[PDB]
Design a protein around this ligand. Structure first.
Ligand SMILES: Nc1ncnc2c1ncn2[C@@H]1O[C@H](CSCC[C@H](N)C(=O)O)[C@@H](O)[C@H]1O
Lengths: 15, 481
């Protein structure tokens, strides 16, 4: 696999 | 007017900092928050900064800016597509796995460039900005947008001026999601965003001083909604220059690619310090260039990316399950689950693919329906660890009867879950056919339909599995190993 895969719009916690 | 807007945000901050009202009253809380947000928004001027003309007019400058800083600009163009908005169209043939896009780090907007920007002083004083790089990115974006001399002006001027995240939904568009799984995350998003706007409005306006910060002259609710929607629909995790940690970043040019099914073909090249993208598949000249965003659910796509993806092969719905402390076998079941690395209760996923349950869920369900004699065999003796080792393997069941019991339970629980929705699958499909709805309303209805369709598939899978193992129980087939 890619060492540093980039996910467009990766989901993050905003609370 | 200036003190009045401050009083309203202070009320909004109090309302949105209160504990959760209870699940039965979250819709009421949502409408109360909307009312206060909408009153603030009608008293404000909209976006603090706007740009003339149509969105197409700004893409040439984005390309020239990217090329002069080392980015790829050959082989594609920015085109307005009917079903996805703007995106990349190949101007030549592109073969699968061909490296066609690269973006050096100097073009990116990152938490690091935010820390070194005009936002820097406030970032160093504010514990929320230091904890939440996504919020920092949003303010980085607002600060640069309001700075005519900003290095990233060619990119900011090509961003959309509006999104289809639920933050932009009308109240009656969100109402379609009542009694769904997804609406709670919609409520959380709306309350988070409002608390953050009110919190930072009081920090910017009240707290010393009148910094070089452009947000001191104008920081509207519209500004903040636009900024967090820009970040959540477009942000990316990349390594830092040292490669020692990860940071959040906006990646110009490449983030204009729209999504289709497939695999991730975008990666960071640390040695050459740039983002790299190879073709997901063959793109003939004139075809849209797509990438695979990631294995996200349609709830996540709607809420965080602002769209619903038909034929999303990773769509899923949550199912909460646990061994109740009321079970007389609780100790044994919890010990077996512990030895298998599974908590006594958790949220699992039902998938719209075949099979609809994961190995973890299959292991839990097996333990859930285990007799005391079967649990003892997973706890004592030289074979106990081996029986745990295969607990999630559909090829090695505990017993025929155990399979029938667990598939009966899943059938029953999925069927029960279908009955907690306000509409049926058939009624949703008739709403979507016989009515002409806004894009955002269709997103809400297709999402509530999608949840039920996933539950419906689990019912059918569990029914078939039930009959398969039950008929093999009657024949007394040898259990495999
Ligand atoms: N498969 C798809 N179907 C519909 N909209 C899509 C899509 N893939 C991406 N999008 C849209 O593109 C956004 C990701 S950024 C991709 C470029 C964007 N279309 C633009 O004009 O700037 C998402 O928020 C969504 O609105």
């Amino acid at each position: 696999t890619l060492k540093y895969p980039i996910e467009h719009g990766i989901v993050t916690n905003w609370d | 007017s200036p003190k009045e807007i401050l009083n309203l945000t202070s009320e909004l901050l109090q309302k949105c900092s209160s504990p959760a009202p209870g699940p039965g009253k979250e819709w009421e809380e949502y409408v109360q928050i909307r009312t206060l947000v909408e009153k603030i928004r009608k008293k404000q001027k909209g976006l603090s900064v706007t740009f003339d003309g149509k969105r197409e007019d700004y893409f040439p400058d984005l390309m020239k800016w990217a090329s002069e800083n080392g980015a790829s600009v050959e082989g594609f163009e920015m085109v307005n597509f009917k079903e996805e908005g703007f995106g990349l169209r190949a101007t030549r043939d592109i073969k699968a796995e061909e490296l066609f896009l690269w973006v050096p780090r100097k073009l990116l907007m990152t938490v690091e460039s935010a820390k070194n920007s005009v936002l820097g002083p406030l970032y160093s004083q504010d514990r929320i900005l230091q904890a939440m790089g996504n919020i920092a990115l949003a303010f980085h974006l607002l600060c640069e947008r309001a700075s005519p001399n900003s290095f990233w002006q060619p990119y900011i001027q090509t961003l959309p001026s509006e999104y289809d995240t639920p933050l932009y939904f009308e109240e009656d568009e969100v109402r379609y999601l009542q009694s769904t799984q997804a609406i709670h995350d919609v409520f959380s998003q709306y309350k988070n965003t409002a608390r953050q706007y009110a919190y930072f409005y009081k920090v910017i306006q009240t707290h010393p001083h009148a910094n070089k910060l452009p947000l001191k002259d104008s920081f509207t609710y519209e500004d903040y909604r636009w900024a967090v929607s820009s970040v959540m629909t477009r942000q990316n995790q990349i390594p830092t220059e040292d490669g020692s940690r990860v940071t959040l970043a906006l990646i110009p040019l490449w983030d204009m690619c729209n999504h289709t099914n497939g695999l991730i073909t975008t990666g960071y090249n640390l040695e050459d310090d740039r983002c790299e993208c190879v073709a997901l598949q063959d793109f003939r000249a004139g075809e849209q260039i797509y990438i695979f965003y990631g294995t996200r659910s349609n709830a996540e796509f709607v809420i965080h990316s602002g769209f619903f993806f038909d034929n999303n092969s990773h769509d899923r719905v949550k199912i909460k399950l646990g061994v109740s402390k009321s079970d007389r076998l609780y100790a044994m079941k919890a010990e077996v689950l512990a030895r298998a690395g599974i908590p006594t209760s958790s949220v699992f996923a039902l998938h719209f693919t075949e099979p609809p349950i994961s190995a973890q869920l299959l292991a839990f369900l097996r333990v859930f329906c285990m007799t005391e004699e079967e649990l003892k065999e997973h706890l004592l003796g030289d074979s106990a660890i081996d029986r745990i080792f295969t607990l999630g393997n559909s090829e090695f069941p505990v017993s025929w009867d155990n399979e029938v019991k667990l598939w009966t339970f899943l059938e029953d629980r999925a069927s029960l879950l279908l009955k907690t929705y306000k509409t049926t699958i058939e009624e949703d499909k008739s709403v979507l056919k016989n009515h002409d709805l806004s894009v955002r309303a269709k997103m809400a209805i297709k999402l509530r339909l999608g949840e039920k369709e996933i539950l419906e598939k689990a019912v059918k899978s569990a029914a078939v599995n039930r009959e398969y193992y039950r008929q093999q129980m009657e024949e007394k087939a040898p259990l495999p190993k």
